[PDB]
Amino acid sequence: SCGGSCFGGCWPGCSCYARTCFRDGLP
């Protein structure tokens, strides 16, 4: 559950995975 864009960095506390923002604990 992270917004932002991969072209300009993912949301705070997330990463750019699969051309999208996603991370354990924060879908």
Instruction: Quote the CA–CA distance of 27 and 15 in Å, as a whole number.
Output: 11
Beta bridge partners of residue 20, listed in sequence order: 17
CA angle 7, 26, 24 (to 5 degrees): 95
- Report phi then psi at 4, rounded to 5: 60, 180
Please tell me whether residue 26 adopts helix, strand or coil conformation: strand
Tokens representing 5 are: 């864009």
* Distinct helix (H) and strand (E) counts, the chain: 0, 2
Residues 23 and 14 sit within 8 Å (Cβ to Cβ)? yes
Element (H, E) at 16: strand 16-17
Helix, strand, coil proportions of the chain in percent (round to 5)?
0, 30, 70
Beta bridge partners of residue 17, listed in sequence order: 20
For 22, half-sphere exposure in the C-beta direction (CA atoms, 13 angstrom radius) is 5
Tokens representing 19 are: 């051309």
